[PDB]
């Protein structure tokens, strides 16, 4: 399988937020409606609701 | 509501309420056309578990 890819975010920033990271879909998505989530330590493991998804 | 909100206090005990929701549809009342199911799809975070609903 190919690894994951990097991003980076900068501390204590003026904002505004949410600031956004990147973009994240299928290539499939086409072929029939899926939505998005993530888990982690981040989102519901914690620091709780650091990260957010579009749905 | 397309986002409803509901209080409940700490420590309470199971099988407490949180809420009632309600919803309609345009076919003609009380026939299967009408006849509704409600369920959960997730949680926030998604465990552990804390609230059920009524089908």
């Keep these: ?55 | 509501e397309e986002t409803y909100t509901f209080t409940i206090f700490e420590n309470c005990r199971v099988g407490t309420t949180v809420g009632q929701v309600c919803a309609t549809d345009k076919d003609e009342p009380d026939t299967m056309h009408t006849r509704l199911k409600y369920s959960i799809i997730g949680q926030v975070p998604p465990s552990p578990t804390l609230f059920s609903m009524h089908p």
């Design chain 1, 1 to 55: 399988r190919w690894a994951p890819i990097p991003c980076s975010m900068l501390e204590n920033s003026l904002g505004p937020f949410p600031l956004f990271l990147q973009q994240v879909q299928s290539d499939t998505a086409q072929n029939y409606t899926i939505y998005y989530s993530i888990r982690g330590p981040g989102v519901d493991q914690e620091p709780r609701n650091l990260f957010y998804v579009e749905r």
